[PDB]
Every structure is written in structure tokens, then in C-alpha cells.
Amino acid sequence: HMLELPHEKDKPVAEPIPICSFCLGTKEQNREKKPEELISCADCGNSGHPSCLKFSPELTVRVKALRWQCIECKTCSSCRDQGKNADNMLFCDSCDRGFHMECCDPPLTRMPKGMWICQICRPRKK
């Protein structure tokens, strides 16, 4: 199961908008005109087909279990702010949470070459 942060629990969940913000299709019609359940932003309600969000099935299953924010709403899970540079907020490849590079421990200055996952998704050591 996906672990939730205390501040994510019992935060309000916005009314979901039942069409995709990318293609304007409902859950009945993604871009291939096939049914596909939407993922919806807990802050603004904006939704997306996982295919339109470019999420894998594995990531989709994970983000559906969490209080997810859309691309525009995403705030840093550490400092809780947005900041002014979008190329400074990494999105976790395991849970899609955002973290500013400077809010990582230790801070990052340079982009990872491959996947990046947050400290929440890294398992505890033996």
C-alpha cells in the first residue's frame, strides 16, 4: 500500500471534474476513444486520463491511492510551496509527489539521469 503523509490525510479533496483537462473526453473516451478512468486533482478537481498524463499503468495504480495534485497544483512535499521555477520541482517516479531540488536531503543541483524517487518511496534499510 502507498504511505500517506499526515498533512495529506484529512486535507479537503476538491470536487473532481469528470472530463480530462487534456483531451476533454469523459471516462468513456480517451484519445483512442476507449474507456479509461480519470485521475483527479485533490486541490482543483482537474482530471486527466492516465494515458493523457503519460503515466504507466504501475504509476497510475500508485497515484490513485494517494492525495494527488495536478501538474499546475503540485506543491513541494517538504516545504509546501510552489516556488517560481518549474524546472526545479522534481516529480517522483514512484508516487508523483513534487520536491524542490533544494528541498531534497541532501539538496540536488543537477538533474538525475534516470528515474528519481523521493525519500518516502525509498524503503528502509536493514
Partner: peptide
């Protein structure tokens, strides 16, 4: 890795 910027470009 992905950022808010890259996600915007990828999905926009």
C-alpha cells in the same frame, strides 16, 4: 527524471 516543466511539455 521529470520536473513540473518537463511534465508540462510532455503532456501539453
Amino acid at each position: 527524471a521529470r520536473t513540473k516543466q518537463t511534465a508540462r511539455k510532455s503532456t501539453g
